[PDB]
User: What shape does this take?
Amino acid sequence: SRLNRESVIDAALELLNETGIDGLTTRKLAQKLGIEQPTLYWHVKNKRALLDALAVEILARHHDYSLPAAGESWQSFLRNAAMSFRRALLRYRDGAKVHLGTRPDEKQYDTVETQLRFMTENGFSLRDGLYAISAVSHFTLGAVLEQQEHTAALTDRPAAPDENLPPLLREALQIMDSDDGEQAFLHGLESLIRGFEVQLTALLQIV
Amino acid sequence: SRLNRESVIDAALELLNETGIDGLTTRKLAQKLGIEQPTLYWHVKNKRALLDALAVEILARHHDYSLPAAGESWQSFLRNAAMSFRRALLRYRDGAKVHLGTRPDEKQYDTVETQLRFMTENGFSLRDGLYAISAVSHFTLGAVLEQQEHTAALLPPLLREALQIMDSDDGEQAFLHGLESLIRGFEVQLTALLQIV
Ligand SMILES: C[C@H]1c2cccc(O)c2C(=O)C2=C(O)[C@]3(O)C(=O)C(C(N)=O)=C(O)[C@@H](N(C)C)[C@@H]3[C@@H](O)[C@@H]21
Ligand SMILES: [Cl-]
Ligand SMILES: [Cl-]
Ligand SMILES: [Cl-]
Ligand SMILES: [Cl-]
Ligand SMILES: [Cl-]
Ligand SMILES: [Cl-]
Ligand SMILES: [Cl-]
Ligand SMILES: [Cl-]
Ligand SMILES: [Cl-]
Ligand SMILES: [Cl-]
Ligand SMILES: [Mg+2]
Assistant: This one.
């Protein structure tokens, strides 16, 4: 079939949902596109190049709240960006692991520049602006990776017998498995934003 | 060599530092222990069983702050536990990746129960206590994973100055700053009770 960049990325993302990141190979991608391996090689050098392109493409296509709206608060921007980032990572099987090996992308640098500009215009030092954006990224990626890797582990092993669990852990596992982590994620996200605001408003005061 | 659980884990952790998690295989572990693969199989069924055990044993060996001190505040306990957890994950190559997706083991049940109970004794519902602990875990894992990926790997104006600041250390500054933000947010939520906040 067609081997323009867009068609190859489309095929590879479909293959990722079929196999997961560990099972995704250039050999399987060639099969899916109906070509020989040295044909594919002209388009796609190796698995690493393929993953770098998927990582960038997943955010380009599906992370559509990367920029603040006109007049938006920095609180609302971090909340909206975090929810978008999390949705984008959950959209594909092992998506967060695909992201975790992104390369530098010039277009992602212009976006982070706009986000750091926005934070500093709203009163953040460059340091505190970067720390806030980083913490939101770290928290969000950590929450998604724990959801996706736990799913991936239920593919291989089981989950331990319920009847030796102490009571609060039993109830905690009931709560953490009652959704895809969304309630926990949204609650932690409010805690993180409010922490940042207490720090911003403190200026040089002991806090 | 010797294939008691402890010797196998010792060998697998040494191998992890050599290869990383993707490169860690039962075949390479058999080589390191000087045995054939079907000997290893008697002791270690597969990579998933090995990774599950390493996640547990890394914390048993190196996570020294899993329980509150006598009289400690929940704020100080979360801070101390998060710093310990991060140090434990940084001790081995791809340590965070080893942890991801695991759930508490039966050997950890008493510890993690005491952590949950401790939060409830300090005014949190089990749910809100779990939400706090989970946020700390997710933030710490994310921060370590980004530091371990930068190791594995190794501009606009504000970003350039930000990269100077980020790479003047390992990640510890950004980590500890975010951790204070998360703790303070949990406190603002706890102290609000049923007030709009
Ligand atoms: C309560 C645990 C839990 C409950 C429900 C689902 C889960 O996935 C977990 C965990 O995975 C926890 C950990 O891994 C700990 O790191 C964990 O296992 C642990 C420990 N063994 O001392 C910690 O220190 C905890 N943390 C870093 C402060 C944390 C546990 O609190 C949770
Ligand atoms: Cl073509
Ligand atoms: Cl194209
Ligand atoms: Cl689609
Ligand atoms: Cl491949
Ligand atoms: Cl707003
Ligand atoms: Cl032996
Ligand atoms: Cl032993
Ligand atoms: Cl293997
Ligand atoms: Cl204290
Ligand atoms: Cl109890
Ligand atoms: Mg865990």
Q: What stands out?
A: Chain B has two domains: 1-65, 66-196. The radius of gyration of chain B is 20 Å.
